[PDB]
Amino acid sequence: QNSNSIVIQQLEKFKAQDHFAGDGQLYTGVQNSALRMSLNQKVADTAQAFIALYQQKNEPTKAELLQVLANGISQIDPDKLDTEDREQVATTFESFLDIVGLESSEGILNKWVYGEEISKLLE
Ligand SMILES: [Cl-]
To answer: Bridge partners of 28?
Structure first.
């Protein structure tokens, strides 16, 4: 029940961060301010969903954690972002996996990044 409060502290901090700034290296960040803010909000929404789960459940199951992840990412239309921005969203959501102790996204994150892209390529 102590781990429960820690994860929540991680999520609260994570929720308040800008996840789409330039990393100094090869990622430049989301330039459209309206879009970046809109994206941080979507991330904040998923973070807040996980918090609600841990508040109602001492030890959430892998399946529970995975559904919150899957529902959080499905809220973002991949056809509205460029490749670099989509990759940053995936990296950002990978951090959730580490936080909640979930090993995999069951291929959900890759399908999100390259799904519509490969579909349009084959079309
Ligand atoms: Cl993964």
So the answer is: none
The CATH code of the domain that includes 20 is: 1.20.1480.40
| Ion ligand 1 residue ranges (Cβ < 5 Å) | 104-105
Q: State which amino acid sits at residue 115.
A: G
Which three-class secondary structure string do you get for 68-103?
A: HHHHHHHCCCHHHCCHHHHHHHHHHHHHHHHHHCCC
53 alpha carbon to ligand 1 midpoint, in Å?
21
Rg of the Cα atoms in the chain: 15
Resolution, Å (one decimal): 2.0
- The number of domains in the chain is 1
Place of tokens 């972002």: 81
Distance 34 CA to ligand 1 centre (A): 28
**Dist. CA 53–CA 17, nearest whole Å:** 20
What is the span of the domain harbouring residue 60?
Answer: 1-123
Residue 69 near residue 96, CB atoms below 8 Å:
yes
